[PDB]
Scaffold this motif. Structure first.
Motif, PDB file in Angstrom:
ATOM      1  N   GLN A   1      51.020  20.939  78.016  1.00 26.69           N
ATOM      2  CA  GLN A   1      52.286  19.914  77.603  1.00 26.69           C
ATOM      3  C   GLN A   1      51.552  19.818  76.045  1.00 26.69           C
ATOM      4  OE1 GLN A   1      54.748  17.312  79.292  1.00 26.69           O
ATOM      5  NE2 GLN A   1      55.376  17.550  76.969  1.00 26.69           N
ATOM      6  N   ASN A   2      52.640  19.915  75.033  1.00 28.52           N
ATOM      7  CA  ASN A   2      52.238  19.525  73.708  1.00 28.52           C
ATOM      8  C   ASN A   2      53.200  18.578  73.290  1.00 28.52           C
ATOM      9  OD1 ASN A   2      51.659  22.573  74.426  1.00 28.52           O
ATOM     10  ND2 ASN A   2      50.756  22.338  72.300  1.00 28.52           N
ATOM     11  N   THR A   3      52.897  17.534  72.307  1.00 28.53           N
ATOM     12  CA  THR A   3      53.785  16.646  71.770  1.00 28.53           C
ATOM     13  C   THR A   3      53.358  16.272  70.528  1.00 28.53           C
ATOM     14  OG1 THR A   3      52.299  14.813  72.900  1.00 28.53           O
ATOM     15  CG2 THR A   3      54.065  15.271  74.286  1.00 28.53           C
ATOM     16  N   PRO A   4      54.256  16.159  69.713  1.00 25.13           N
ATOM     17  CA  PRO A   4      53.952  15.747  68.149  1.00 25.13           C
ATOM     18  C   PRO A   4      53.165  14.683  68.049  1.00 25.13           C
ATOM     19  CG  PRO A   4      56.204  15.063  68.393  1.00 25.13           C
ATOM     20  CD  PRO A   4      55.963  16.045  69.682  1.00 25.13           C
ATOM     21  N   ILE A   5      52.219  14.621  66.894  1.00 21.87           N
ATOM     22  CA  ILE A   5      51.468  13.327  66.644  1.00 21.87           C
ATOM     23  C   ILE A   5      52.546  12.659  65.718  1.00 21.87           C
ATOM     24  CG2 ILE A   5      49.480  12.536  65.389  1.00 21.87           C
ATOM     25  CD1 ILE A   5      47.881  14.980  66.615  1.00 21.87           C
ATOM     26  N   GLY A   6      53.120  13.082  64.594  1.00 17.69           N
ATOM     27  CA  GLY A   6      53.819  12.614  63.842  1.00 17.69           C
ATOM     28  C   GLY A   6      55.311  12.223  64.314  1.00 17.69           C
ATOM     29  N   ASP A   7      55.913  11.395  63.300  1.00 21.86           N
ATOM     30  CA  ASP A   7      57.333  11.072  63.955  1.00 21.86           C
ATOM     31  C   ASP A   7      58.480  11.840  63.434  1.00 21.86           C
ATOM     32  OD1 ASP A   7      56.562   8.622  65.375  1.00 21.86           O
ATOM     33  OD2 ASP A   7      56.070   7.772  63.579  1.00 21.86           O
ATOM     34  N   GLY A   8      58.161  12.898  62.648  1.00 24.82           N
ATOM     35  CA  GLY A   8      59.023  13.731  61.777  1.00 24.82           C
ATOM     36  C   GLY A   8      59.725  14.419  62.795  1.00 24.82           C
ATOM     37  N   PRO A   9      61.050  15.055  62.396  1.00 23.05           N
ATOM     38  CA  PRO A   9      61.707  15.997  63.351  1.00 23.05           C
ATOM     39  C   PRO A   9      60.741  17.407  63.609  1.00 23.05           C
ATOM     40  CG  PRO A   9      62.907  15.780  61.171  1.00 23.05           C
ATOM     41  CD  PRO A   9      61.431  15.313  61.065  1.00 23.05           C
ATOM     42  N   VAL A  10      60.951  17.735  64.990  1.00 16.26           N
ATOM     43  CA  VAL A  10      60.571  18.778  65.201  1.00 16.26           C
ATOM     44  C   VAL A  10      61.635  19.857  65.678  1.00 16.26           C
ATOM     45  CG1 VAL A  10      58.214  18.017  65.565  1.00 16.26           C
ATOM     46  CG2 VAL A  10      59.882  17.960  67.344  1.00 16.26           C
ATOM     47  N   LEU A  11      61.109  21.109  66.133  1.00 14.66           N
ATOM     48  CA  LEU A  11      62.144  22.202  66.545  1.00 14.66           C
ATOM     49  C   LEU A  11      61.819  22.162  68.211  1.00 14.66           C
ATOM     50  CD1 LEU A  11      61.557  25.071  63.861  1.00 14.66           C
ATOM     51  CD2 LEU A  11      63.747  23.456  64.462  1.00 14.66           C
ATOM     52  N   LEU A  12      62.984  22.040  68.644  1.00 13.34           N
ATOM     53  CA  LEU A  12      62.748  22.200  70.127  1.00 13.34           C
ATOM     54  C   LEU A  12      63.154  23.510  70.720  1.00 13.34           C
ATOM     55  CD1 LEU A  12      63.378  18.599  71.363  1.00 13.34           C
ATOM     56  CD2 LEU A  12      61.087  19.467  71.123  1.00 13.34           C
ATOM     57  N   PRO A  13      62.457  24.288  71.463  1.00 15.38           N
ATOM     58  CA  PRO A  13      62.665  25.719  71.792  1.00 15.38           C
ATOM     59  C   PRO A  13      63.687  26.055  72.897  1.00 15.38           C
ATOM     60  CG  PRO A  13      60.609  25.435  72.572  1.00 15.38           C
ATOM     61  CD  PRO A  13      61.093  24.122  71.787  1.00 15.38           C
ATOM     62  N   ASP A  14      64.456  27.180  73.017  1.00  7.97           N
ATOM     63  CA  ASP A  14      64.876  27.611  74.274  1.00  7.97           C
ATOM     64  C   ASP A  14      63.693  28.292  74.728  1.00  7.97           C
ATOM     65  OD1 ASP A  14      67.497  26.830  73.700  1.00  7.97           O
ATOM     66  OD2 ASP A  14      68.071  28.781  72.817  1.00  7.97           O
ATOM     67  N   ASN A  15      63.833  28.649  76.121  1.00 13.25           N
ATOM     68  CA  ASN A  15      62.735  29.099  76.826  1.00 13.25           C
ATOM     69  C   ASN A  15      62.246  30.677  76.147  1.00 13.25           C
ATOM     70  OD1 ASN A  15      63.475  27.025  78.747  1.00 13.25           O
ATOM     71  ND2 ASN A  15      63.536  28.447  80.663  1.00 13.25           N
ATOM     72  N   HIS A  16      60.996  30.826  76.027  1.00 15.36           N
ATOM     73  CA  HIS A  16      60.324  32.004  75.684  1.00 15.36           C
ATOM     74  C   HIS A  16      58.917  32.026  75.962  1.00 15.36           C
ATOM     75  CE1 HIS A  16      59.555  29.335  72.383  1.00 15.36           C
ATOM     76  NE2 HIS A  16      58.558  30.084  72.025  1.00 15.36           N
ATOM     77  N   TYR A  17      58.225  33.017  75.544  1.00 14.66           N
ATOM     78  CA  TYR A  17      56.944  33.183  75.773  1.00 14.66           C
ATOM     79  C   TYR A  17      55.972  33.684  74.596  1.00 14.66           C
ATOM     80  CZ  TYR A  17      57.997  38.190  76.656  1.00 14.66           C
ATOM     81  OH  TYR A  17      58.489  39.157  76.919  1.00 14.66           O
ATOM     82  N   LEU A  18      54.820  33.430  74.597  1.00 11.76           N
ATOM     83  CA  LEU A  18      54.103  34.187  73.640  1.00 11.76           C
ATOM     84  C   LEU A  18      53.327  35.082  74.272  1.00 11.76           C
ATOM     85  CD1 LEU A  18      52.631  30.827  71.895  1.00 11.76           C
ATOM     86  CD2 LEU A  18      54.831  32.114  71.437  1.00 11.76           C
ATOM     87  N   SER A  19      53.191  36.171  73.839  1.00 10.72           N
ATOM     88  CA  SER A  19      52.318  37.390  74.164  1.00 10.72           C
ATOM     89  C   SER A  19      51.164  37.400  73.527  1.00 10.72           C
ATOM     90  CB  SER A  19      52.981  38.690  74.282  1.00 10.72           C
ATOM     91  OG  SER A  19      52.294  39.927  74.458  1.00 10.72           O
ATOM     92  N   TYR A  20      50.012  37.286  74.457  1.00 10.49           N
ATOM     93  CA  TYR A  20      48.546  37.053  73.850  1.00 10.49           C
ATOM     94  C   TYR A  20      47.866  38.461  74.316  1.00 10.49           C
ATOM     95  CZ  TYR A  20      48.130  32.230  72.463  1.00 10.49           C
ATOM     96  OH  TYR A  20      48.220  31.204  71.829  1.00 10.49           O
ATOM     97  N   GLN A  21      47.212  38.940  73.238  1.00  4.71           N
ATOM     98  CA  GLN A  21      45.978  39.789  73.636  1.00  4.71           C
ATOM     99  C   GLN A  21      44.819  39.464  72.690  1.00  4.71           C
ATOM    100  OE1 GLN A  21      47.160  44.187  72.876  1.00  4.71           O
ATOM    101  NE2 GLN A  21      49.390  43.175  72.428  1.00  4.71           N
ATOM    102  N   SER A  22      43.556  39.462  73.416  1.00  2.00           N
ATOM    103  CA  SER A  22      42.362  38.803  72.931  1.00  2.00           C
ATOM    104  C   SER A  22      41.185  39.991  73.104  1.00  2.00           C
ATOM    105  CB  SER A  22      42.006  37.675  73.655  1.00  2.00           C
ATOM    106  OG  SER A  22      43.036  36.755  73.490  1.00  2.00           O
ATOM    107  N   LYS A  23      40.395  39.725  72.084  1.00  2.00           N
ATOM    108  CA  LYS A  23      39.181  40.596  72.258  1.00  2.00           C
ATOM    109  C   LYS A  23      37.931  39.818  72.009  1.00  2.00           C
ATOM    110  CE  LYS A  23      36.551  43.571  69.261  1.00  2.00           C
ATOM    111  NZ  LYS A  23      36.832  42.774  68.173  1.00  2.00           N
ATOM    112  N   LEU A  24      36.999  39.662  72.933  1.00  2.00           N
ATOM    113  CA  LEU A  24      35.735  39.099  72.736  1.00  2.00           C
ATOM    114  C   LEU A  24      34.607  40.004  71.999  1.00  2.00           C
ATOM    115  CD1 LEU A  24      35.748  37.161  75.866  1.00  2.00           C
ATOM    116  CD2 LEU A  24      37.251  36.928  73.927  1.00  2.00           C
ATOM    117  N   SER A  25      33.778  39.282  71.315  1.00  2.00           N
ATOM    118  CA  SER A  25      32.699  40.210  70.788  1.00  2.00           C
ATOM    119  C   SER A  25      31.522  39.194  70.478  1.00  2.00           C
ATOM    120  CB  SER A  25      32.991  41.293  69.749  1.00  2.00           C
ATOM    121  OG  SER A  25      33.437  40.355  68.439  1.00  2.00           O
TER     122      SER A  25
END
Ligand code: CL
Length: 228
Positions: free
Chosen positions: A182-206
């Motif tokens: 869950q994510n919630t804003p810290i400030g009171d300013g307006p935020v963008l609330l999204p339609d359903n979507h996803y973030l595609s991640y690729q990661s490399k450890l070294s």
């Protein structure tokens, strides 16, 4: 641009990460620095265990240790909650269930402190098996690619997400880690609330070949997707 916070991510942004952890009573701290470039969806961090030896595998901390650096395609710009909450930032909270093992609970604040994007985290782990894949350090030092599924949580003026991480086991299959977020804003300013979507991640450890402390170098590539 469709949020004022988006303006803050047009170039390279320095990052600081600070984590305090306690897993089955094994305490530790991690401090990291690096930079993020949301125009390309890329971030790089070097993370050091400042308490000596990390008592869990580094891969198990990857998701806890910056979704505001996702690249949102132009047609998706109205769905970027994360940047819209800047600079005041957001709270990111998770429960992470390791299948057949214990769980992590995390609370982080992600916000600007001056010109630096800072991720400050508390993590508590419980119910782990001392000879399991986590406390027994049986996980490969690498990272698979995953999608983070996001939905709006209008009641909290924020978002929710869930995903399943597959951690490769040395000479074995995978250790699953089911994430609820869950994510919630810290400030009171307006935020963008999204339609359903996803973030595609690729990661490399070294590793940094000149670093003698227990550490991880993490590169993430993150792209928003899932809307035509
Ligand atoms: Cl490790």
């Amino acid at each position: 641009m469709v949020s004022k916070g988006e303006e803050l991510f047009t170039g390279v942004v320095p990052i600081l990460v600070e984590l305090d952890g306690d897993v089955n009573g094994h305490k530790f701290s991690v401090s990291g620095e690096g930079e993020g470039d949301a125009t390309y969806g890329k971030l790089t961090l070097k993370l050091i265990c400042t308490t000596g030896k990390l008592p869990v595998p580094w891969p198990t901390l990857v998701t806890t240790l910056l979704q505001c650096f996702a690249r949102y395609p132009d047609h998706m710009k109205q769905h970027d909650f994360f940047k819209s909450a800047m600079p005041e930032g957001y709270v990111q909270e998770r429960t992470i269930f390791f299948k057949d093992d214990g769980n992590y609970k995390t609370r982080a604040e992600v916000k600007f402190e001056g010109d630096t994007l800072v991720n400050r985290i508390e993590l508590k782990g419980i119910d782990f098996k001392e000879d399991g894949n986590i406390l027994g350090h049986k996980l490969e030092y690498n990272y698979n690619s995953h999608n983070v599924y996001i939905t709006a949580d209008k009641q909290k003026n924020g978002i929710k997400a869930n995903f399943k991480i597959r951690h490769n086991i040395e000479d074995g299959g995978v250790q699953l880690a089911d994430h609820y977020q869950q994510n919630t804003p810290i400030g009171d300013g307006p935020v963008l609330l999204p339609d359903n979507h996803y973030l595609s991640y690729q990661s490399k450890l070294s590793k940094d070949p000149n670093e003698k402390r227990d550490h991880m170098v993490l590169l993430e590539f993150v792209t928003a997707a899932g809307i035509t």
